[PDB]
Amino acid sequence: RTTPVSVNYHFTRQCNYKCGFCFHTAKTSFVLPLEEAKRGLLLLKQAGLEKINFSGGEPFLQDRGEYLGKLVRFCKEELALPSVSIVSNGSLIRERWFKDYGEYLDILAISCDSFDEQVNALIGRGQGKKNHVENLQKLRRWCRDYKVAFKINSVINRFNVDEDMNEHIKALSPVRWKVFQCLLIEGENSGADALRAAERFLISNEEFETFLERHKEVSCLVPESNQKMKDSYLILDEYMRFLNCTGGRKDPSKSILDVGVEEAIKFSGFDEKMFLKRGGKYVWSKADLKL
């Protein structure tokens, strides 16, 4: 009964950053061959896909960004998907990629948890070599130049919960600013079998709400508490298995490449009502936006 309208494909678990709360960790080095990823994406389109978001891991890592670029163009041009988006740490994105693939990308989301360099060092977002605020503005201006909608994602955690980001976010003029409460996922950032330990990053719901109220002036803010975020996505892992988070883990279905979309998605644990409640359906085609 679940139509895969908007799906996240975490095609790699490799990353070049070390965020201490990371909930999608470097557990394998498996990435599908490009042709098999395309086959899976076609299956999703035949099942009703409208929006694909490429995630990870850091999606720009694979084949020096060309794997991601080829999938972006395939989805936009061959599948005719209404929306093709990416969530990225932004560290590896070069102007050449915009020249080659930007036409086909609706939305580029860059994760930015703080505009303070010491906070980003506490979190593990890079090694502070780049001027982070300038790099974000550089990507934002390339999104302007190459006509891609710009989005920012922030994880609200112990180290940025008191931060005032109003001016910095407005200066980047995003179409969408997703504000996530830091989320615990067993086997990723919690428990004995996890590469990360997010407990020391967590904040209460009350603290999260205080952050939201501080940023009411930002029109593009989309808030996601733990309850709004945990089960409200369709998440495909690097084997194109749906990850079910209803048990606090990322429990994989069988692969859509083996059993098909309809069989696998029955085990996704997707909460469609919450997907809608958090604003998961929106004007997501850049051709329908005013950039």
Ligand X SMILES: Nc1ncnc2c1ncn2[C@@H]1O[C@H](CSCC[C@H](N)C(=O)O)[C@@H](O)[C@H]1O
Question: Does 19 count as an annotated binding residue?
Answer: yes
Give the contacts of 79 (CB within 8 A, at least 6 positions apart).
41, 42, 45, 49
Q: Choose which of 13, 24, 132, 140 interacts with ligand CTP (CB under 6 A).
A: 24
Judged by CB under 5 A, does residue 4 bind Cl ion?
Answer: no
Question: Does 112 count as an annotated binding residue?
Answer: no
Residue 189 touches which member of ligand SF4, Cl ion, ligand X, none, C-beta under 5-8 Å by kind: ligand X
- Supply 8's token pair: 């996240």
- Supply 27's token pair: 């557990």
Specify whether the CB–CB gap between 242 and 267 falls below 8 A: yes
Q: In angstroms, give the least distance from the CB of 200 to ligand CTP.
A: 19
Annotation says 182 is catalytic: no
Q: Residue 122 region, left (φ>0) first, then alpha (ψ -120 to 50), else beta?
A: alpha
Residue 40 touches which member of ligand SF4, Cl ion, ligand CTP, none, C-beta under 5-8 Å by kind: none
Annotation says 245 is catalytic: no
Annotation says 15 is catalytic: yes
Using the contact rule CB under 6 A, the part of the chain among 123-131, 133-141, 208-216, 228-236 near ligand CTP is 228-236
Query: 59-68 burial, b for 16+ CB within 10 Å, e for fewer?
Result: bbbbeebebb
- Of the candidates 181, 172, 125, 130, the one whose C-alpha atom is nearest the C-alpha of residue 152 is 172
Judged by CB under 5 A, does residue 65 bind Cl ion?
Answer: no
How many residues touch ligand CTP under the rule CB under 6 A: the total is 19
Give the contacts of 274 (CB within 8 A, at least 6 positions apart).
227, 228, 231, 232
Residues contributing to the site for ligand X (CB under 6 A): 15, 21-24, 55-58, 87-89, 111, 153, 155, 180, 182-183, 189, 198
Judged by CB under 6 A, does residue 230 bind ligand CTP?
Answer: yes
Judged by CB under 5 A, does residue 3 bind Cl ion?
Answer: no
Give the contacts of 43 (CB within 8 A, at least 6 positions apart).
256, 257, 260, 261
Which DSSP state fits 186? Answer: B
- Of the candidates 48, 59, 57, 62, the one whose C-alpha atom is nearest the C-alpha of residue 23 is 57
**Distance set, CA 189 to CA 65, 185, 199 (Å):** 26, 6, 8
Specify whether the CB–CB gap between 71 and 104 falls below 8 A: no
Judged by CB under 5 A, does residue 102 bind Cl ion?
Answer: no
- Supply 33's token pair: 């061959």
Residue 57 touches which member of ligand CTP, Cl ion, ligand SF4, none, C-beta under 5-8 Å by kind: ligand SF4
Interface mask toward ligand CTP for 248-287; x: CB under 6 A:
--------------------------------x-------
Q: What spatial distance separates the first Cα and last Cα of the chain, rounded to whole Å?
A: 36
Q: Choose which of 4, 13, 21, 23 interacts with ligand CTP (CB under 6 A).
A: 23
Tell me which residues touch Cl ion (CB under 5 A): 45, 223, 225, 228
Catalytic residue ranges: 15, 19, 22
**Binding-site residue set for [4Fe-4S] cluster:** 15, 19, 22
Q: What does the binding site for ligand CTP look like in residue numbers (CB under 6 A)? A: 6, 8, 23-24, 51, 53, 55, 85, 87, 109, 153, 176, 178, 229-230, 233, 235, 245, 280
